[PDB]
Amino acid sequence: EYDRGVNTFSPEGRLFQVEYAIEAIKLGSTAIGIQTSEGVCLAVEKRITSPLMEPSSIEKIVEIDAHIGCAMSGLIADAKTLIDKARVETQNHWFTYNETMTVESVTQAVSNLALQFGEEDADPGAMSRPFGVALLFGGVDEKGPQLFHMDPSGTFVQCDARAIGSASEGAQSSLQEVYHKSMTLKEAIKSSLIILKQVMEEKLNATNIELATVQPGQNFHMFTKEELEEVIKDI
Amino acid sequence: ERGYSFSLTTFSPSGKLVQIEYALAAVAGGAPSVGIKAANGVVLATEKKQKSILYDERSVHKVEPITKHIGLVYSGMGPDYRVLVHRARKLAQQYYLVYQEPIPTAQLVQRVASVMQEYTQSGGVRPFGVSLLICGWNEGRPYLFQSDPSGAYFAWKATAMGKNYVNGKTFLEKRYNEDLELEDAIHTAILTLKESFEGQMTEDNIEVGICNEAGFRRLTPTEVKDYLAAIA
Amino acid sequence: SIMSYNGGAVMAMKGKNCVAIAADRRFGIQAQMVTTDFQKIFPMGDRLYIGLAGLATDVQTVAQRLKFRLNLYELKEGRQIKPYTLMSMVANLLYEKRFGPYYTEPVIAGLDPKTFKPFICSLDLIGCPMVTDDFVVSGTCAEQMYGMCESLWEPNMDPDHLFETISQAMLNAVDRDAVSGMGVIVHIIEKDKITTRTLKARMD
Amino acid sequence: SRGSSAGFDRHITIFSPEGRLYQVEYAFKAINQGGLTSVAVRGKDCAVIVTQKKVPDKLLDSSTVTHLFKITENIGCVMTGMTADSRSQVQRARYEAANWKYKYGYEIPVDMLCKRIADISQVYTQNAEMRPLGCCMILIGIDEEQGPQVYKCDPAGYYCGFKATAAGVKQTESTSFLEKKVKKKFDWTFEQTVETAITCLSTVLSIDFKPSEIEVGVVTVENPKFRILTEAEIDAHLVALAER
Amino acid sequence: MEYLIGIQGPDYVLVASDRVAASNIVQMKDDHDKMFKMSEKILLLCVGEAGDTVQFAEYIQKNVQLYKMRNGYELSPTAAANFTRRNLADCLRSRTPYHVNLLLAGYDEHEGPALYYMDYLAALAKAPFAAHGYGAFLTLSILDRYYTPTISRERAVELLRKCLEELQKRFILNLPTFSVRIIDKNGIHDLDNISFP
Amino acid sequence: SYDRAITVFSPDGHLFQVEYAQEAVKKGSTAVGVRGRDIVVLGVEKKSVAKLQDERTVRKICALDDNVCMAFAGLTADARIVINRARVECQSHRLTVEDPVTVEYITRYIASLKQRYTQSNGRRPFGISALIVGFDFDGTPRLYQTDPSGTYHAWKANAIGRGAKSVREFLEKNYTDEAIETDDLTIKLVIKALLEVVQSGGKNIELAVMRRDQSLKILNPEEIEKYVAEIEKEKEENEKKKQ
Amino acid sequence: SRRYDSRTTIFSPEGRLYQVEYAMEAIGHAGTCLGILANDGVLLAAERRNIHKLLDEVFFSEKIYKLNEDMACSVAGITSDANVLTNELRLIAQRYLLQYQEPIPCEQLVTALCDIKQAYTQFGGKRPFGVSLLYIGWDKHYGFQLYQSDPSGNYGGWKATCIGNNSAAAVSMLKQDYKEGEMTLKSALALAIKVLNKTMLSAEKVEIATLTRENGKTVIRVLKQKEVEQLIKKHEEEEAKAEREK
Amino acid sequence: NQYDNDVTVWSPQGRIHQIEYAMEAVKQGSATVGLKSKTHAVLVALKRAQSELAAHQKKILHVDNHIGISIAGLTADARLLCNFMRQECLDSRFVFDRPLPVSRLVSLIGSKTQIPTQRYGRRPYGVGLLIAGYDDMGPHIFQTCPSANYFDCRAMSIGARSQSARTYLERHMSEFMECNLNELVKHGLRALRETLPAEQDLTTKNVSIGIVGKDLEFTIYDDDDVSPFLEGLEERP
């Protein structure tokens, strides 16, 4: 309703719009990121809605830069502006400093947009509402592999393993049950796919999920259907 | 502050712009005004009753010249009328500056009506609460127009505005005649005002302007006194 | 010099109950002729014409913008424009560019839409209007045209005599100007008709 | 209808179903919140403004508590209603008069200044985002052609010249008294005009004024400059009134 | 300096342009195309300053194609020529004027072939034949000499060859090859390049 | 200017304005798209055929460039705005990249425009959904769908507008490798899908086809009637087979 | 301020734009306008509502506006809104002529105006224009044309159509009386007179404008009282004969 | 109610409810303590972990060599304010070639955060700050609030359950001036521990420290760098 401005605090000290946007996150398809010493693995349920749809057109994991990928959950159309800002940020950083932006810096630059919405004293081009999407930025910088979570409130945090989206509760509990700091990238990929298979409704197969990894050696890499098939076979 | 950007006049489920109807109610509660287009001129007359004798009746005029050849009068809210008079004089001068010719009456009426329309759609304003009678003379011809709060305008041979204007229009229908001269038109206009007038009319109770070939001019209290003595 | 870039000449003349407007036909760039049928006289009403000399691009731009404004004026007012009002409109248009002026010096010739009274006038490039009772001229060969018109013009000429006078003036004036000529077009405007003629002229 | 309402017509300046502007009427009511009253009377060759002076606290600096303001050397005014609204309006009037002299080379006539202020007020009555000012301005000055001039403008944007007028709580009774006075005659001398103004105020308030309870400002054709009287002159007038 | 030429016949318009792109004293390209297809039946030939030419020509091309997309029918050659002139004239007094000289060739199904000449000042002129560049000084007289309104396309190509051979003989610049195109009711046809080894 | 926030979150995390725009889309006439091997077919329910209307002026199928065309469902005027923006963008892409747009590129542009209008002050969302079909420069047929929220997907066959649910269920049961082997069968699949919803016959159907390397081709009513007659023949013959 | 904002440009829970629907409701009560397309011309016929005996006539017509050499329109709805839109239409036409030096094709003019209307329905927080327009015109691409547009910014071309009061009954009559491709200006005028008679006639109560081509030039003409009186009398005697025959 | 949605609406009691709600935003945040001696200013922040696998949110930020801050409340507003403060310090060093005095920075923050509390459609900043600085007047602890008020404190604590920390600080403040750095940090840590529930305890993961002083630029200690300060800490009651 319009009884309140978008910048109205609740009596409990929270912005109404941000809390509603978080509620919106809780309707997205489930994504899971796991950070290990050998790299970061991102996975996301595609949620095919019709067999006439082309699963390849569902892009839930995108490349921010050769060393940074992002998984997203919630209102995916809202994520496009944030993804473009992150990409432009990394390329501006490379242009100015002749070096690669750290995952934390990219996450910070994106999170600085979360609360930049409002109505009065706002020029055209101003956002009228918060973004209804949560992001998992996985990457590899001088500090090794890094996994970061950002939500609509602009708060971002480094995580060892994080689940976002509709089933994030059970997914997070399982991740806590299975994660150890010494696990290998293969172990993390297998565990993430097991958790996704568990929390998903449709049977997990090579077409209805997305899986990417970032490693110190290789750049951001999206698993092909055959690699996905090989990983799924051992589950 | 900056003004509100949203329109205060919007459509109702029945398709009416009710704020315009309410501004028209304000107009209908105004002091009576009359216009008559004669063969050789136009007469604008209006009741000018003061609340008390303390009012310097000759300090504020209801019949105003817009140009040498265009005058106007109103029914409704005085301050709104002053706004519209200032705008009309500005518009006439702009036309003169571009075309080096006195603005035709119809063109002035169209421009003023355009302003009035703008005030029915722009953000954070109400419509003007006035109706205007605009008289002019050009191309060897007299013109009488009415412009409403909605920005709609009509050409009239004779008309009445303000309180009791329906009876005034019936009276004008009965009395009016296309062939009558300007002095007969003045007599008819004063008679129309008399129909809805409370108390005795004096040269200080009503205001009269006339437009003809020479131009538009407000009549003096002595001339109105002569016309009133003749009317009796 | 900027207005000598393309050359050209227009002239208008007043008769008894008629007007004449004439123009040379050459479109060239400095010394080179490009075409010999470039339009410099534009109708603005049934009995109202404007001739434009000077820079060809500004000739075309001013004619088009004037037609824009005149079309809007005649739609809004529901009547044909009077010659004096057209003169004022052109003056306003040109003065709007007071410090970026169009390089053209129009002449106007017409009859009153209601009285059919002759009207002619000329304007400088920033829009100063000059109404005259005999003749006006504009273009590179203005001095030559002034000589011819001062010598040949007479009051109260009938249309045939007006035609001969303006034709001889234009032909002999442009014959002494290198960058004007390549033909002459004349419009005689009367109450009942418009007569357009092209003259036998030197093509060098 | 009578006193009918639709939508938001009681909160912002939009027409009620009767064609009224309720917020303007409420600004007129706000004029009376100050609790004071001022009267202005036009004589033959003078104009006078009298007004109540109230200083309930002896800690107040009485010099700073006034409702009479110089707008120009030859134009003075008395303001009634909300004090801060009145001060803003006085500032605007001073600006308008100075700008007029700068642009046109002669002093602004009283009627023209009143018209300008009234036009500003009218704007307040047609734009919804601001309220009207809750004050009324009475201006006096000598016009070289018309003679003495008393003009009044109000929050509706309506203004008028007057032979005599009043503003504030006792406006109606003041106008009745002055109507009787002007009906009996109007060609007053300076002393007569001052005494008429003072008597109007005293009768409507039913008080007999000490010099310090009222303020008087005058313009005269002899001295067109606006002058505020001193307690000495006011007491002289009060004694000359009591004796008669 | 580049060379453009156009010859309008009864039911066609033939245009040709040199194919040289030069930097200072060097020919950097010998197969440069100066003709921009505005539409199925409209060609724009543009010469002039190094950057202005392509920027202006491609802006006009984009807007003409957009007109076709929006409305379902193409702009007529005369409408296209006037749109071009309006844009050029409006940029003439602005911050960034374009120093371009143009020929616009077209064929209208109801108005026949059209050839328009525009100089960088944005003066527009319909002509039966026209030429741009220093070479125009050496060829316009040949066209005046031999052109007739009822010239056939084969004879028009022969006349064009006469002009280009005059350029070979007399012009100080090395202009060895020319693109040649014809517009008629059937659209735009590429003819064989006219070359001089 | 006017800078109210129109699209805002509600307590359950829903954007009511986007949902209401999608309701408006569901009020539109059904549009169907099928992606064939060498042909892409768009059909639209020409609802309430008025004998006095000039059909050329109310076509819901339109061309964005030589290789991309669009059908839509929802508010016609909003669709006109979006189509004009997309045409301008296609010409800009030609200007700057010196090649035609991919179907995905212009689809992304339109979806981004819509998303922008769901998150900017003083604007409501576009009340249209679009099917964008075309051929990429390399020859691949493409069918995409966009909705008011600014999300878009690629489809093998799809429907939008009123009765899109039933049409989509029919297309699920009927989109096969055999059913799109030839242009005739692709066109007939589109016609059958529309006939499952349209009130009566092929009178109420507008059909357009895009073949590889060719421009948008509108099927005239005679061709549509011939195809409908073939479909009725097939239906009768197969029902006789069943009996 | 949020409290007083009407929220004109928002969807409703059913996907409707209430201000646009209310504006169309307003148009439904305005004076009847009808357009009829024929092979040799196109006509507009409008019911006059300014019928008071003391009104003066000074203008070309009450409800028919010339837009340019080749195009005219009639307006049903809010009069002052209509004046705004007719001025914008004339400006659009003249801008096109300035840019291209040819008259604007009719559909391009209609689309340009409908874009303005649609904009008013999507952003800015203003009430929409409460006007529907009928356009008649001629151009070289499609010949004689008749269009209609409404406050939503939707528009369509028609062979015959009606807006304003009793538009539904007039449309039914046209559906049952219009001969596609077989209409002349004369039979079109007869049909217009019949339809206006049903959905309501006398000469002073209707204004009729015709648009034809004469010598490669467009002629827009408002029929004078004589011609309209003759048309009404012809319809009256036609109806008398039809009644008598039965 | 009708008075508790906009910052420009005074309630009949003379309060502005939106500002109080922003105060609540601050009161929800995790506790942080600031204190000082004659020579040092110390910030100790208890960091929260949203999940047992997530890193604890950073609570102490750099502003300038002589100024650091601890934040409690909305972290995006905290970042906005921190960026503004950093720019102010940079401007001071650019123009005057000297560090910005802490009190002037606090005054600038006050003006910046007061502006939105009076304009329609704006909201208060939803963050409280503890500012530790050192300048020519010695060490400074300041507390800034969403109400745009700021306080100069001998010691302060803000955030959830910070009343216990304030009780400890009130009890022990007499000793802070004559404390060495280690004792000062230990007092800060005990005060912060008073905010913890019984189950929770201070570790090297949920504690961050910030120290500034005469010869010590503002330094943030995290993870094992906190172990030296925690080593001497006794066991809580």
Swiss-Prot record, chain B:
GO terms for cellular component: cytoplasm; cytosol; extracellular exosome; extracellular region; ficolin-1-rich granule lumen; nucleoplasm; nucleus; P-body. Phosphorylated on tyrosine residues; which may be important for nuclear import. Induction: Down-regulated by antioxidants BO-653 and probucol. Down-regulated in response to enterovirus 71 (EV71) infection (at protein level). InterPro entries: Ntn_hydrolases_N, Proteasome_alpha, Proteasome_alpha-type, Proteasome_asu_N, Proteasome_sua/b. It is found in: Cytoplasm; Nucleus. One of its GO terms (biological process) is response to virus. The keyword DNA damage does not apply. The modification Phosphotyrosine is found at residues 4, 22, 74, 119. Its main location: cytoplasm. Coiled coil: none annotated. The modification Phosphoserine is found at residues 5, 12, 14. The modification N6-acetyllysine is found at residues 68, 169. PROSITE patterns: PROTEASOME_ALPHA_1 (PS00388), PROTEASOME_ALPHA_2 (PS51475). Belongs to the peptidase T1A family. Component of the 20S core proteasome complex involved in the proteolytic degradation of most intracellular proteins. This complex plays numerous essential roles within the cell by associating with different regulatory particles. Associated with two 19S regulatory particles, forms the 26S proteasome and thus participates in the ATP-dependent degradation of ubiquitinated proteins. This is Proteasome subunit alpha type-2. It comes from Homo sapiens (Human).
From Swiss-Prot, chain E:
Pfam families: Proteasome. GO terms for biological process: proteasome-mediated ubiquitin-dependent protein catabolic process. The keyword Acetylation applies. Keywords: Acetylation, Cytoplasm, Host-virus interaction, Nucleus, Proteasome. The modification N-acetylmethionine is found at residue 1. It is found in: Cytoplasm; Nucleus. Signal peptide: none annotated. Induction: Up-regulated in ovarian cancer cell lines. GO terms for cellular component: cytoplasm; cytosol; extracellular exosome; membrane; nucleoplasm; nucleus; proteasome complex; proteasome core complex. SUPFAM superfamilies: N-terminal nucleophile aminohydrolases (Ntn hydrolases). InterPro entries: Ntn_hydrolases_N (IPR029055), Proteasome_beta2 (IPR035206), Proteasome_bsu_CS (IPR016050), Proteasome_sua/b (IPR001353), Proteasome_suB-type (IPR023333). The keyword Nucleotidyltransferase does not apply. Belongs to the peptidase T1B family. The 26S proteasome consists of a 20S proteasome core and two 19S regulatory subunits. The 20S proteasome core is a barrel-shaped complex made of 28 subunits that are arranged in four stacked rings. The two outer rings are each formed by seven alpha subunits, and the two inner rings are formed by seven beta subunits. The proteolytic activity is exerted by three beta-subunits PSMB5, PSMB6 and PSMB7. This is Proteasome subunit beta type-2. It comes from Homo sapiens (Human).
Curated annotation (Swiss-Prot), chain F:
Changing residue 111 to D: Found in patient with severe intellectual disability; uncertain significance. It holds the Pfam family Proteasome. The keyword S-adenosyl-L-methionine does not apply. One of its GO terms (molecular function) is identical protein binding. Phosphorylation by ABL1 or ABL2 leads to an inhibition of proteasomal activity and cell cycle transition blocks. Induction: Down-regulated by the ribozyme Rz3'X. Up-regulated in colorectal cancer tissues. The modification N6-acetyllysine is found at residue 226. It is found in: Cytoplasm; Nucleus. It comes from the Eukaryota. The keyword Disulfide bond does not apply. GO terms for cellular component: cytoplasm; cytosol; extracellular exosome; nucleoplasm; nucleus; proteasome complex; proteasome core complex; proteasome core complex, alpha-subunit complex. Glycans are attached at residue 129. Keywords: Acetylation, Cytoplasm, Glycoprotein, Host-virus interaction, Nucleus, Phosphoprotein, Proteasome. GO terms for biological process: proteasome-mediated ubiquitin-dependent protein catabolic process. The modification Phosphotyrosine is found at residue 152. This is Proteasome subunit alpha type-7. It comes from Homo sapiens. The lineage of its organism: Eukaryota, Metazoa, Chordata, Craniata, Vertebrata.
Curated annotation (Swiss-Prot), chain G:
The modification Phosphoserine is found at residues 12, 74, 172. GO terms for cellular component: cytoplasm; cytosol; extracellular exosome; intracellular membrane-bounded organelle; nucleoplasm; nucleus; P-body; proteasome complex. It is found in: Cytoplasm; Nucleus. The keyword Cytoplasm applies. The keyword Secreted does not apply. The 26S proteasome consists of a 20S proteasome core and two 19S regulatory subunits. The 20S proteasome core is a barrel-shaped complex made of 28 subunits that are arranged in four stacked rings. The two outer rings are each formed by seven alpha subunits, and the two inner rings are formed by seven beta subunits. The proteolytic activity is exerted by three beta-subunits PSMB5, PSMB6 and PSMB7. (Microbial infection) Interaction with HTLV-1 TAX protein favors NFKB1 activation. CDD domains: proteasome_alpha_type_4. The modification N6-acetyllysine is found at residues 126, 175. One of its GO terms (biological process) is proteasome-mediated ubiquitin-dependent protein catabolic process. This is Proteasome subunit alpha type-4. Transmembrane segments: none annotated. Keywords: Acetylation, Cytoplasm, Host-virus interaction, Nucleus, Phosphoprotein, Proteasome. Induction: Down-regulated by antioxidants BO-653 and probucol. Belongs to the peptidase T1A family. Its main location: cytoplasm. SUPFAM superfamilies: N-terminal nucleophile aminohydrolases (Ntn hydrolases). It comes from Homo sapiens. Pfam families: Proteasome, Proteasome_A_N. InterPro entries: Ntn_hydrolases_N, Proteasome_alpha, Proteasome_alpha-type, Proteasome_asu_N, Proteasome_bsu_CS, Proteasome_sua/b.
